[PDB]
């Protein structure tokens, strides 16, 4: 069972190795990675890996190697630079009692596993029953350094019906280690007296 | 196998601005390493000037803070030394250095000698 | 900065003996430390890094150890290619700090 850390793109975090070793020419260490320089702090009993201004690049399995006495041991983790912004978008724009389909999209986000990044229709609060989503198709959007994602989510929608409901809202849900993070945008739905006279 | 190879002016009139050129050969300077500019001083006194990275951002000597600018160049996989309103104590030998965590300052170049003076 | 004081400045040894050189840096710098030899003329190679760590391609003969703030280069077996002057660097703070230098002479 590999240890999963989770740090947001941009956010700090340490990760602490400690080796038990009562001899001498004892050391501990985390693999250092040709990105970074000085980001390890290492001792004879701790090794302390700090990552500021975390990129995509400090992303990956870090190693932490120790040996006590001629005696090797490494202990493995997984490092997770997740980017989860507030930047959803929705076609139509609003919506018409009838219509049968509505996408999601989010922006410039990752991971994209369907099982981290799920995606949502709500109706007042909950999800919408009658909806059924039609897979998710994600894209490789262009913003050099380093290669994010973009997911869009599309539904049938069902009769709406009445009453008309006021709006409704797609949720991006990212599911992380003991952590939920959720986007919502509002999709209007425009009813009864939608153009009227004097 | 990794070279560096520094080139530039050896002479250099005060006031003026010294500039330096080191050609990487085996490697990419965006593909990964911090690359450096060190120079030093006659009597064998180091000094690191600062370096920029792979991803093209810079760090440097607050000493030198205000005069200096490591730029680069990925087409030609070059990157730059230049040093503004040189004076004399500037007279040093300048070597260039790729350093990283899984290296730690492996590579350097020849070294060049820029003398300052009228 | 962080002031890196290494001695001493200039040591004579025998060819095969073992000799070791120290580094002081003003505060803890947590074995972020190269070692650097260089040889009359030439330039540098960049022989430990993060203290106790060999890059390839380098005898065994050399080896780093220490902590916090004391750090030393220890050399073995030393052949006649070893003759030369050795720098410490540390790298856990801008700006990056050498150490004075060590003059490595041979008795013959």
């Known amino acids: 069972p590999e240890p999963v850390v989770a740090v947001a793109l941009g956010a700090s975090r340490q990760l602490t190795c400690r080796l038990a070793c009562a001899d001498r020419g004892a050391s501990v260490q985390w693999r250092g990675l040709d990105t970074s320089l000085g980001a390890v702090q290492s001792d004879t009993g701790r090794s302390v890996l700090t990552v500021r201004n975390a990129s995509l690049s400090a992303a990956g399995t870090r190693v932490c190697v120790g040996s006590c006495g001629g005696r090797t041991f490494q202990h493995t983790v997984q490092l997770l630079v997740y980017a989860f912004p507030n930047q959803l978008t929705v076609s139509p724009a609003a919506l018409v009692p009838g219509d049968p389909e509505v996408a999601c999209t989010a922006h410039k986000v990752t991971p994209v596993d369907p099982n981290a990044l799920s995606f949502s229709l709500l109706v007042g609060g909950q999800e919408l029953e009658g909806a059924q989503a039609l897979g998710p198709e994600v894209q490789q959007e262009p913003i050099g350094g380093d290669v994010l994602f973009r997911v869009t989510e599309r539904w049938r929608l069902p009769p709406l019906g009445t009453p008309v409901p006021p709006a409704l809202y797609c949720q991006a849900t990212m599911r992380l280690p003991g952590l939920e993070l959720s986007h919502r945008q509002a999709i209007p739905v425009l009813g009864g007296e939608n153009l009227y006279f004097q | 196998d990794v070279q560096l190879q520094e080139s530039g002016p050896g002479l250099v009139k005060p006031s003026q601005s010294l500039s330096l050129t080191c050609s990487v050969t085996?490697?990419?300077?965006?593909?990964?390493?911090?690359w450096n500019w060190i120079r030093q001083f006659p009597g064998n006194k180091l000094e690191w000037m600062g370096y920029?990275?792979?991803?093209?951002?810079?760090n440097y000597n607050p000493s030198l803070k205000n005069r200096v600018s490591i730029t680069r160049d990925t087409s030609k996989n070059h990157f730059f030394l230049k040093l503004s309103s040189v004076t004399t104590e500037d007279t040093a030998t300048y070597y260039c250095a790729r350093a990283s965590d899984s290296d730690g300052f492996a590579y350097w170049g020849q070294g060049t000698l820029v003398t300052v003076s009228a | 900065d962080i002031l890196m004081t290494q001695s001493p400045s200039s040591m004579s040894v025998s060819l095969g003996d073992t000799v070791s050189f120290t580094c002081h840096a003003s505060?803890?710098?947590?074995?972020?430390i190269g070692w650097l030899q260089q040889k009359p003329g030439k330039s540098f190679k960049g022989l430990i890094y993060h203290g106790t760590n060999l890059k390839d391609g380098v005898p065994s003969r050399f080896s780093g150890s220490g902590s916090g703030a004391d750090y030393s280069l220890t050399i073995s077996r030393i052949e006649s290619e070893d003759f030369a002057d050795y720098y410490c660097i540390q790298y856990v703070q801008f700006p990056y700090t050498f150490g004075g230098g060590t003059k490595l002479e041979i008795k013959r």
């Open positions: 920029i990275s792979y991803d093209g951002s810079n």
């Open positions: 505060q803890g710098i947590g074995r972020n």
């Open positions: 085996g490697y990419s300077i965006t593909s990964g390493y911090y």
